[PDB]
Design a protein around this ligand. Sequence first.
Ligand SMILES: CCCCCCCCCCCCCCCCC[C@@H](O)O[C@H](CO[C@H](O)CCCCCCCCCCCCCCC)COP(=O)(O)OCC[N+](C)(C)C
Ligand SMILES: CCCCCCCC/C=C\CCCCCCCC(=O)O[C@H](COC(=O)CCCCCCC/C=C/CCCCCCCC)COP(=O)(O)OCCN
Ligand SMILES: CCCCCCCCCCCC(=O)SCCNC(=O)CCNC(=O)[C@H](O)C(C)(C)COP(=O)(O)O
Lengths: 103, 178, 55, 128, 124, 84, 459, 88, 70
Amino acid sequence: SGYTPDEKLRLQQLRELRRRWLKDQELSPREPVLPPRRVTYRHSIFAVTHVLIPVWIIHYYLKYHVTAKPYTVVERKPRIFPGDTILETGEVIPLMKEFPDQH
Amino acid sequence: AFSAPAAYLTHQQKVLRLYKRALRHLESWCVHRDKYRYFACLMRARFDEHKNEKDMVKATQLLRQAEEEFWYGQHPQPYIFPESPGGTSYERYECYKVPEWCLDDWHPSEKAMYPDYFAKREQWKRLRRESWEREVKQLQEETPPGGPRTEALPPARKEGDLPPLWWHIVTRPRERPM
Amino acid sequence: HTGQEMIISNWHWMTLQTVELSLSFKMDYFSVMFIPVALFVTWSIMEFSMWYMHS
Amino acid sequence: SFPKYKPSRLATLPATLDPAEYDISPETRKAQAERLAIRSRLKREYLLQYNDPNRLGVIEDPALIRWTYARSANIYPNFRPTPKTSLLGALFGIGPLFFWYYVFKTDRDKKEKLIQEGKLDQTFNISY
Amino acid sequence: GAHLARRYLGDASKEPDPLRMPTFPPDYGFPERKEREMVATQQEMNDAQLMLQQRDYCAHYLIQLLKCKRDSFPNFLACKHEQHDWDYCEHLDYVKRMKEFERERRLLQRKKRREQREAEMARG
Amino acid sequence: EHGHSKMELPDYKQWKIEGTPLETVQEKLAARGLRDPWGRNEAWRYSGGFANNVSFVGALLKGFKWGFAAFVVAVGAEYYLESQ
Amino acid sequence: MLKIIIPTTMLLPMTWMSKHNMIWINATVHSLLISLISLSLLNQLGENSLNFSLTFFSDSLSAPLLVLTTWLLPLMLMASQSHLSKETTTRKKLYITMLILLQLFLIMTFTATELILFYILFEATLVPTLIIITRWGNQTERLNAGLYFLFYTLAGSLPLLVALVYIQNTTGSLNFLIIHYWSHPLSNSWSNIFMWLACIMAFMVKMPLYGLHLWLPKAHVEAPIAGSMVLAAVLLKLGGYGMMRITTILNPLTNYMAYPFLMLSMWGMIMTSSICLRQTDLKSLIAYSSVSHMALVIVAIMIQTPWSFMGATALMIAHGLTSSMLFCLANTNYERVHSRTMILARGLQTLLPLMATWWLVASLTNLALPPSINLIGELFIITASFSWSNITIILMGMNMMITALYSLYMLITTQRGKYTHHINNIKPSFTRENALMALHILPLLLLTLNPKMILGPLY
Amino acid sequence: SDAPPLTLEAIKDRVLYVLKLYDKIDPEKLSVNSHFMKDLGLDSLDQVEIIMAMEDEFGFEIPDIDAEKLMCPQEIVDYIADKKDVYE
Amino acid sequence: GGVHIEPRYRQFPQLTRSQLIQAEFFSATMWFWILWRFWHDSDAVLGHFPYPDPSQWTDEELGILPDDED
Ligand SMILES: CCCCCCCCCCCCCCCCC[C@@H](O)O[C@H](CO[C@H](O)CCCCCCCCCCCCCCC)COP(=O)(O)OCC[N+](C)(C)C
Ligand SMILES: CCCCCCCC/C=C\CCCCCCCC(=O)O[C@H](COC(=O)CCCCCCC/C=C/CCCCCCCC)COP(=O)(O)OCCN
Ligand SMILES: CCCCCCCCCCCC(=O)SCCNC(=O)CCNC(=O)[C@H](O)C(C)(C)COP(=O)(O)O
């Protein structure tokens, strides 16, 4: 049981070669030679170039093109409760019939 | 993995493999350390009551019945190491292993970066270039007539020689290349 | 505050005889309620990922 | 006295439960030795063709080409019309066709009858 | 459950099947027969557009709760008395439903007892 | 920036079976005539900060004391502010 | 229509007078210019048609096919630039001449106001394709493949000619306009049954129909890359165009004569989709996928409803583009591996990431991912079949699932996994291949913005 | 992860640490080049138990074909280093 | 983004006071919230309206006649 002498010798040689190769895989301090050439504030600019401009574009598109055609934007009619007043008409909605309130 | 396999497994090897499997599945069953240690010592003792069995026809019947018992209580969800062939991270980084010869296809602009590494790369390539020519002759002279019997390779026997068929073993990419 | 509901049919894709297919979005209770939850969870998961997946 | 494991087609029998990996004979050991010898010969050939620095191509595998040819271009020359082959071909190439034809014909006959008699409620079925 | 056990382990006839309730006329009990009163009309209840399942006898308290929620939005927990009144009215409705269940059960029990007594008398 | 500080392994003689449930395992094994050779290798799991454990209910009631104190002071403040 | 036919004809003298090292540039540039000119035909009108003259006319069924045919040639030239590098100048000019002749025949076939001229050009397309398959084919089986690709087709269409002339002896004309305006029903008779069979079997065989598809895997596997492109993209749609044109006179017989073909197609889609699951060859897998898609188109045409026609047209266009791109990717892999086997080359996303991206996009498009025009045609045909019968969806649904399976299988076996160790001749993808992939894939995603351009005259 | 790049010295130290906690081996007699059944008089079962103890120590498991022939602490260290690609 | 923490090798890992105090504070707020909600809103667990007893109802309100009128 165990390694034969040939196995030991081959393993030792292979691991020495592997360690040499792995050491050769390293990088020199100047190894990545990069060739140079050129041709609140961060959040402030981000909120303008990523939020404000899309809001402007979509508001224009919805207000002046989408709504230019009928039935493109349909709103569920607001809920109506007794005692409310309609802005368009100004008439007051009749209240309830004074149901008997007890507990 | 690194060692070549044999034509068959002896009784000793089968006994050792069964013992290791039983211990692993026992520690899978016995989660806690003290309980596992107690039951592992107990199972080593019950495995040891038949060490000195002499006749082989009776020692093969003991292990044959031990393989019928292990299967019955083998914990259908055993513990597996993460990098083992059944683990959760077995071949996780297998797609990051890029062969070395790919560097031969790099553009000269890319090879302008990292000059020392590439210089060492031609050094290694030349070393392999002479080494392979030596190893063909060495392996042809050392092989027995009719072809090899086991896939175990001989080492280098001279001074400047290198072990035959060494390029693709030492140039493994890495364990975690990226 | 109000119970605002809306559907927006901005872009008309194609008319197949009597069937009109358009890019229509529904902004009912479910949509306007589930957008913030999903966005908050995604923000948390991305901040977690910046540390988990550094390698 | 534990319950016995019954191997199946999709759940085979473990190697450690093989009743043939114990009753070992010298003939079995010789067969294993020959198998290892041929396996080592093939491995040595592949490794010699693999570590050669002068090779800049794909190592052709005769086994792969042989497998592809057997799967693709050898089926017909070894084909012989036999009762098993004839019955299986007739079944798998005719039965589904008539089955689906019968199903669809029955469904469409019922639909057409319901159209003719008139109670189907075809309202809003404009686009067809 | 107790009703489920009694119906599925005893006699099915003595206790009602909730799908077919009621099986007796409303005027069988007493003759004054007071009718239920709704305070929410058609138009205001439709305008509130509560829900079809919410358009029950308890509608006015739900409308008041919606109105107080809309009026005081930022402090959501402002109106809790209205929520309690709506819950109490729902509780009273459920108690009325249970009273209907028990009334039908007792009417059926009395009918069964009367039928048994009549059969016993006719047998002799 | 990495964690390179040349950490040294502790002394191996401090790991003892004493004060651990491995004592019970050793006693039970010796009562039959057996010994556990790997006992000390797992001593570190019962030696340092891992010596003390917490129950399931104790784990659930992790911050019960501070929360109860905060609730008491809050309800007292509410009682003393409403009564005016 | 001559403003497009004449430049295609003039492509031949320009190629034959060009320098030995400048034929490809001239051919590609002028083919792209011709495609740009042919883009004008896409401006169809809801009215009758664009009746240019007595011989040529254009419809919104012919226009997308013409545009696709004109656009295909530059892609075929770029694909064939590689494997014809060591070819003599005369033989390269002959190859380009064959491609130009095939485009001219297809362009004249897609307008074809008269039916006999349509048939003559329909069969004229058979000669350059046969020459390309049998001459510039790598393997030894090509000749046999060519034989198949010939005889099947002719066996289908020789009766048709007789039927055609018979019609002109009774109707008196074969102009499609007069045929459409003077249509009369076919009575239920044996003679009418055989006339229906003669008219239909001609286009069924080239589509192809299940059971008559044996020539197609051979022809696509054995042909060069340009041949595979032209067969999968345009030459398969000739049968569908012919059927949609000729079914105007087969009513109401088709209402009961389409049952065998509907059953054959609805079962052959499943059979070929399952065949794709277990295939040792990429080209055969792509060919069988093409067979499945064409069987679905056959079902759509046999249903004969407006949604069926719209879905059939959209599916033909989308399938042509997708199959062309898939064949190009397979050829790019083959040119490095030189084996044409799925499992020999593995783990290619580690070595060629952009090619892996192209493979992913092509697989997704084949997988019929919304809102691609592939799924537009798929859903149109599916809803039309559901209206035809509520049970068909079952089969259709199965097909869809199986489709995705093999598609991702083709993506997973070739791209994912570990690379083959003993293959060290995988060079980085050229700019030509990437440009070819982009020119294949961008028109699909641009057409999905304006589907009505490929939805046919019944939109 | 933030895992330090373990070195040959660290591997050898951990191997010896695991071996010394095994009370069946004399701590003052064990060496890096000590054999198992010869220098220490162990058994095969003890050898596989040491293999498994190192397996749990280093978080990876050695195949049986390679484990049944690791007989010295030095070659165990070298095997682990080759597996983990340790430079120095 | 944090502080430097060293490996221990069989000792208790380094703990900063910030994480301990933060975890304790969060657990305390959780339990305080639970207690506050139980005190202020206790009917959410026990109920507010008692369950009526069907047997306690008398026949006068249930429209029951003494089995003789009808
Ligand atoms: C192989 C790959 C695919 C290729 C194409 C396959 C599809 C070809 C099938 C062509 C359509 C069906 C053929 C005949 C259709 C006629 C209708 C028939 O099916 O219905 C019955 C007809 O019954 C029998 O079919 C009568 C003919 C029987 C003899 C024909 C041979 C049938 C089997 C031949 C199989 C060979 C296939 C390969 C050919 C090379 C109803 O009888 P009846 O209502 O009273 O008469 C209808 C006709 N009328 C109205 C004009 C009077
Ligand atoms: C890939 C292989 C496909 C091969 C082709 C399959 C289709 C073959 C269909 C028949 C071909 C010829 C049909 C004739 C063309 C139409 C002309 C016509 O309809 O006129 C008929 C003539 O009808 C015929 O003559 C038909 C006879 C058929 C002769 C050829 C037989 C070929 C084999 C027949 C069986 C095949 C059918 C199924 C094929 C399935 C596909 C393989 C009426 O003649 P009249 O005398 O003017 O009117 C009578 C009243 N005065
Ligand atoms: C949870 C799952 C439980 C599974 C339980 C499985 C069954 C466990 C009980 C097993 C029963 C037996 O012992 S089966 C007994 C099998 N027969 C023999 O052991 C006879 C000869 N033994 C050898 O030769 C060995 O190699 C030896 C000398 C021991 C060492 O050798 P080394 O000196 O070279 O290390």
